[model samples]
Target: MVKVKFKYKGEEKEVDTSKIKKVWRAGKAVSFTYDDNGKTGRGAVSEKDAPKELLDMLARAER
Candidate 1:
């Protein structure tokens, strides 16, 4: 399983990429979360279709 975290506007969120079984060519897969102040937000990516450079980074990090 692969997990990813994203930060925006001082807020942080996380998601598990394993939940995504298929990635469309153009559509993104998203996950949601809320801040301590109850502000809701989302994080997303192109699933397994992420750029090769990022995939390579993930592989190296796992080692």
Candidate 2:
């Protein structure tokens, strides 16, 4: 399994490699995600970008 990192709403997000329906690199910033994408979309999802704090929040929450 593979994973990718990118910015969404301003914070870095990571997810199952498969969720990446279509994308390209910038060598810096500015990428994309398709909310109306196929399979990978699953319509919705969200997870830790790293180790967990199950009952709390991200060490640096996207919040």
Candidate 3:
């Protein structure tokens, strides 16, 4: 699993790319859903707040 870090809700979060189920982009924000220990969590972060690598991974996930 690829691990990446980004800002979420004013906090720094590290997420596993393999666990991401879906990703969506709206306006200047990017949101995504992920499965963690059978519990799905939602995350929303600004484009500039996230890493380019994470953004690229999310872009592929949306498809």
Candidate 2 per-residue lDDT over residues 1-63, each given as its tens digit: 454454555666565443434343333322334333443332122343322331122212334
Give the alpha carbon lDDT tens digit for every residue of 1-63 in model 1: 566665555576554554333222234442333333444444445445454544554455546
Q: Which lDDT values do the candidates have, in the order given?
A: 0.46, 0.37, 0.75
Candidate 2 yields a Cα-based lDDT of 0.37
Q: 1-63 in candidate 3: lDDT tens per residue?
A: 566565667787767877877778888988888887779877777788776666887667667
Ranking by lDDT: 3, 1, 2
Better of 2 and 3 by lDDT: 3
Global fold similarity of model 2 (TM-score): 0.33
Q: All predictions: root-mean-square deviation over Cα?
A: 9.4, 11.6, 2.7
Pairs that collide, model 3:
none
**Best of the two (2, 3) by TM-score:** 3
Q: CA shift at 20, candidate 2, in angstroms?
A: 1.3
TM per prediction: 0.31, 0.33, 0.65
How does model 3 score by TM-score? Answer: 0.65
- Backbone clash count, each prediction separately: 0, 0, 0
